[PDB]
Amino acid sequence: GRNWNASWIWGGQEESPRNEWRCFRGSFDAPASVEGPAMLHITADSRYVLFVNGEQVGRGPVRSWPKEQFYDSYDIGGQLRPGVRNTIAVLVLHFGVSNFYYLRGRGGLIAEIEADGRTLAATDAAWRTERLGGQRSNSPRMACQQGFGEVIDARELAEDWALPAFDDGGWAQARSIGPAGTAPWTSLVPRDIPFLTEEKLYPASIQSLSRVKAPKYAAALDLRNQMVPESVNHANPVSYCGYVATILTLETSGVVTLGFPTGVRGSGVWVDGVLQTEWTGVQPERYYSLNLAAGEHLVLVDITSSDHGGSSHFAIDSEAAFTLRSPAGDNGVPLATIGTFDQSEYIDHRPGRRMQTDHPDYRALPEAAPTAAALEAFASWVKPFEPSLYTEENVFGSNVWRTLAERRAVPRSVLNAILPVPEPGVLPVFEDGDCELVIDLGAERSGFIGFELEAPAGTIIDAYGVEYMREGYTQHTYGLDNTFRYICREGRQSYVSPVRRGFRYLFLTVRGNSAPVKLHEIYIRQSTYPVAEQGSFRCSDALLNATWEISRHTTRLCMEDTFVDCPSYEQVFWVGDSRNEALVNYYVFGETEIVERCLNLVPGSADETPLYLDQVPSAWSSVIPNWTFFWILACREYAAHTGNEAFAARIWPAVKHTLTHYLEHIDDSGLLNMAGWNLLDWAPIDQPNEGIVTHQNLFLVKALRDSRALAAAAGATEEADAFAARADLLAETINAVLWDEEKRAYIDCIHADGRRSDVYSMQTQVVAYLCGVAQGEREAVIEGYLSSPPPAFVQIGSPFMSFFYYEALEKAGRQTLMLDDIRRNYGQMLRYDATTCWEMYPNFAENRSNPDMLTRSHCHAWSAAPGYFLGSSILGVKRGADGWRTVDIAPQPCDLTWAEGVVPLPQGGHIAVSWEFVSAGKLKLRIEAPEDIEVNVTLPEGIEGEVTQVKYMS
Template identity: 65%
Template sequence: MTTHDWTASWIWGGGESSPRNEWRCFRKQFECPADFAGQAQVRLCADSRYVLYVNGMRVGRGPVRSWPHEQFYDTYEIGHLLRPGAVNTLAILVLHFGVANFYYIRGRGGLLAEVAAGDVALAATDGEWRTRPLAGFSRAAPRMSCQQGFSEIIDAREEDGDWSGEGYDDSAWERAVVIGPVGTAPWTKLVPRDIPYLTEEKLYPAAILEVNRVETPAFMAAIDMRNQFVPESADHANPIRYCGYLATVLRLERAGTVTVGLPTGLPSGSFYVGGVAVKEWRGEQPEQYAELALPAGDHLLLLDATASNHGGSFHFGLDADAPFSLRSPLGELEAGAGTPFATYGPFDHVEYIDHQGARELSCDHADYLALAAVSSAAELEAYREWARPLDPGMYTEADVFGLSVWRTRVERKPVAPELVRAVLPVPEPAALPRFDVGDCELVIDLGKEQSGFIGFEIEAPAGTILDLYGVEYRRDDYTQHTYGLDNTLRYVCREGRQRYLSPVRRGLRYLIATVRSAAGGDPSADVSNNVSGNASGKREPVKLHEIYIHQSNYPVANQGTFRCSDPLLNDIWEISRHTTRLCMEDTFVDCPAYEQVFWVGDARNEALVNYYVFGATDIVKRCLNLVPGSSEMTPLYVDQVPSAWSSVIPNWTFFWVIACEEFIGHTGDRAFAQRIWPAVRHTLVHYLTHLDKDGLLNMKGWNLLDWAPIDQPNDGIVTHQNLFLVKALRKAAAIAEAAGLAHEAEEAGFAASSDSLAEAINGRLWDDTRRAYLDCIHPDGRRSDIFSMQTQVVAYLCEVAEGERRATIDGYLAAPPAEFVQIGSPFMSFFYYEALVRSGRHAQILADIRRNYGAMIEHEATTCWEMYPNFAENRANPKQLTRSHCHAWSAAPGYFLGASALGVNRKDAGWQTVEIAPQPSDLAWASGSVPLPQGGHIGVRWTRSDARMKLRVEHPREVSVNVVWPEGLEGELEEVVY
């Protein structure tokens, strides 16, 4: 079938075209002919994501991330699931975000699906399909992060049977609304999926590490301040800044001590109680807690919500030794509607496109300034024109993250031996401990970082709450909470035994599962009835039959291998391999937990590691093809795609050009070169318009290379990106040559531009006194007084430094000057290692890997960290070693141990000729294999004794192998051809 023969129409339901966080069910029953031959396909697509069921069996998930103007659809073979001569059921759950993020452009809710047996259409989406929102799902679930969609809150008591199965009665559901045929905006073009489907492997945890009795504050809520203050910000993912207030009235029944808890900290640093600012806060950053002695009665709580906000939730909690309630200062709660909060403002707001605001935020409005002194709800009436009730869709008291971070009491208990049944595939369940006061918390270790879909089977009384929270790092009594990521799930049980598999992807190493008793009534009860203290009453047994994760990644096998005489390097290679696999979804992603975003620059290094570890090429081609889709946003291409954040990192576009050339070289795919060349030419032509009168790239953007404190302002002349532009122009010329279009690169002047740019860099950005390239020239003409290893490495790597300057920098590579800014991330280390390879310093690569990655292994890492310990973003909390504990931009050893220690490198396009040049350094032996893009592998095993090396090389007969022996060693070769 082609995109021109669809019989289906796009459909939706309900009254909103793009509802915030709606999970909507669709069903269609259809007859399968009695003479059905056994072959049938379903094609489908949805905005934003779907889960497909056929006769109650889950078939697949999708679609892959897409630009709306080029929407991917999926095709599944389902003939084996159909019953000839009977009624069959197609059921589809659509998760519509309704909010733009870093991997989704906001469109509208929609489903397109059809089933065909050969040329016979059996079912197609139209106005006869039945639909309704998923029963028991709360649309008020918190945003996971600015990069992602939403966490989930499920109340299974509201379910009325298995809606995906064939016996379910959907006659009371509404009929779907037809949006339009294929080609309807925003999905103007449909294209078939261009990569294989992802894996789903059911993995059980390794252990239960802790059992705790925990008590939690009486009140906790998650609030979406961004979309409350600036509703139109749901249409984009650009950062915004606004000024305004959040207000509620605390009614204390008797005098007591009230604790205000802000698990993610204050937005602006100002919190007022009755017009008086709270000054004394405690807690490790970013958490902030304050104890207040208050008399009985009403107290106005006013939070200055002024902030820069990219998206996510604000968490607000209260606890007290006296009964209390909250009410809105507007009074709506008493009328039976609304939330206990109101907002005032925004008095001003600014949107930042590509890190630039149209103007400065103005927070000098007289009413804004005066509000800080307001002491009561009555006084707030004077500012009614600025007031808005907090939208219930932006608010939930089912704040699993807040309750997991702020626990008012924790009492550790022994882990009973029978609890192991909860993490093993055995038929007997584990009965969870019960406490007279407090909840039961299990800390579950998955054994290593994983990425996928959490599932469980539990037996419990109706109303029992199971809260799940995933984190990446724990050590001793320290848990690194996922500030900035609401990595949680709340499930409210129906009576009896039940199963649940979340459709929301999560990354985690540890799963914190808290069982909260059903006693005390409805967990969603109105906050006005809330009092301090935990619920009490009869507690029936809760049995956990199993808990697991459906690991889901791009389908790759471990074709690349590496082992050597140093066990530390073996462990480092393994965490590099595992990190890369976890960051391979429908694109490369930066990390499986915090973001799950395809960052264009990260993917260049990730692709190289993948070539050596897994050998996958379809995912690389898909990533490269997605980037030019952002040309409608900017001809400079955005740094993460497809994304609603208009953000340009020039280096990321340059890395994309470099990665295109490397893919062509790796695969020999000249057809790809021909297809991608126009997009490469398009963006570089536009970058060259940003050269100043002296021939240097001088522009506004996110001028990033490393997290280290190098001088890389978002405006002006930044040396490292001028250097990478030189390399990108040269690689572009190579792409044109591979495409047979060298004359077009010559017409665009890329070779001449790269030479003149290199000359300008050497003329203006070299400092003779410091014998180094400076980091930048600021917009006001001020030359940076900061010198960094980053800039020197890039100058060497991009071959702009020549002659004496190159020799000088070569010395810096060997012994980095202490006064230079040092490398701050494993991402930058990748380029450093590339430079060390060029300078022949292979032993130094191993030493650096052992030092920096060895620190990760020392801390029991199973994946590579985003940053080096206690650097930059980590300094606020010395226990936080890095933000993300699984970041594929950091997996450099997976590439360099194969390319350097094994010495396997291609010498021409498509790996027709391979050079084997082992670099033993201090190793006694090494063995491994590197997969080839055309299939097969290069196998290498060497041992070294004194001045002699024995080398075994295994390769396909179609591949020519040249061996280069290490300097000073005699060689004995065994060549095996297959």
């Protein structure tokens, strides 16, 4: 790190407020001249947006474990005004709630400008601070994995708060928290990757315009934090038992519709003590029709369930007037919760008490309190709803359930809204209803939504992004409030959401405006790890070219400050996914720093568990054996790719440490037996959280062996011999126990009660093949399955698993089968106009809100296999020695007539290869690479040809 001369500062009384955006301003007189570069070092909790003299300079910090809080260093020489007063402005977003990429600490900002060994500015009590005006701290929690979707009322926002000439005389002074090193940020460590990109991209088209209406009542509730207040300090799943209650009063008799955008969490809904047995809606949505008479009615919604986090939705609509009020003491929120009768926190790798649903009051309450009066007998359980966890400004619910949706032809003028032209797009004003615009980016993107417009004060601008829609069907992001609401001040204004969102289609809905709104522009500032299209692949098969294209795009969008599973739902660095994502990255982009950064973050979870977390740095203490095994694989692959022995030495201890503890989980049977999340694929694999799951037993063998490479590269090869012995013992036990003679294949698992599974999957067989556990006769048998998968076996359910399958086909020399599989499986994605690779394949019920959905996430880089295999298995480019000191060129044209591509090299430069058949059985091949790289060339079986090898200077 560095020695700081600045102090962590914050403002307000609460140390860690929920969902609060706070502004900071600091000024200083810059010297007439400065020799060296003027560096600005900064970090914040939770995230920040930096401005220097009014100009937005950057965002951060990168995700960190509070123990090693990463700080950024910017060269601000470009924004610095020599010899005069300069202004530093910062917007700090403090979550006040833990998630999958942030561990709750406390609000704070620390920044220091240094030049020529002298401190020119530093955060301290002299700085000014105030909450961002109009930012509602009760806005919806975005998702169990992320932060919050914002609601901003610009009428209360000081637009020029970041400008040098802004008058902050009335702003309170900031409060010092302490010097660098003050808890909870034990140490401040320098950002270990370059800065992310941020490029303004305009949309491709306007898909539709509609006159619409949201439900009279729509609210987003954070039931997790309301029912289990302490859950704000972690991101583990919790379960609670109880109800949501409100008194519905109708001025006159009429029909009322209860809407549940995300469904009913518990066993059901009760009205006046009567269980509503009828309802409509496409899962997970549900709507109830109530034919009520004038008067008061007690509505009780059972919410007993497991809740990982995120907003729960409740809506009501009727042609009749109605009011709502809490059965408890008035506090502003018309709802109350009853409970918490029982609860529990789930740590998937540790035993723990589970919530029960037999509490006597919970069971009797519904029917025992048909009125608010009768509810008095349960008064001790009726609690008010915490205001900050409740909001009626619900963009998601207002989009999922539209009481009116009337398509209108798109006026030419409106198109101007997505074009970089001077003429604005004038939106039509409907006499009765809102104006909904569906903006199509043309492809999935990830970044910050921005716009500029002119509108009457109070006009509501709602934004909601989705990944997929087709012919009247919109796949809503259930579980993700991918939204923001902006309320207009008078006149022209601009806004850029500081919350990252991933989506392809943006529902932009304008409400409450009396006069026409002029949309000057709507766009997205895409942001990813700095990648250039240095790698490439094209061939005679246009379908394969398209699969490569979406694989490359998917990888790009899943590369932030760390690799992430997806840009929409989570934006989380999942360890398992990163192994495949890194390999694809090597072939399509060639970046290495992001890979090492990710590999280095994993050991930081050692304090939580020696088995290591499946996603980091996170507050969800969760473990998936295979993910940790894939981390070891990724470490080996990274060390071999770069030839970075220093890294191998640094990481070896962490590798040895975790493997040592996994071995302790092998019992009498001599097999890995664990009580936890024993996952591999999203398919009907018999992989119980119970005992002996075959696939992870197989990967442990390979992990134990793969570890040697790191040990040897680290210069301590002997420290891995013990693991090598255990691998043999394990492999033998596996072949001795987990194999079925009659079926001639490995069983999925052995249950806790010792019951051997009768379920057979392609997955387990593929893994046995790749891990080298299946040898001789059994190997040949597995190879038969590879070329002809038994339809009776469980099938591969995700392109993630397809990746491992392709590695097996490569090992078996079945490249043509690999190509046909890619054509079929990725071709189906393209059929539905995919611009990125799907998380899972269609027709599998796992991991999705509705079994009819093609997939949950439409952009998961763990599914970008073609980006790696086309260049490696087909074009023919493979690493031949660590650090690519030698390269093996062995094309496998299969049924292609030509192909060409480029693979970047970690040391710089690239490997360019092109080939085409000039006549039957005869190829023309060109190879270009740096002169110091040895090239081994092998034409495919029975093929002759002309090879042109070109070497250029390093």
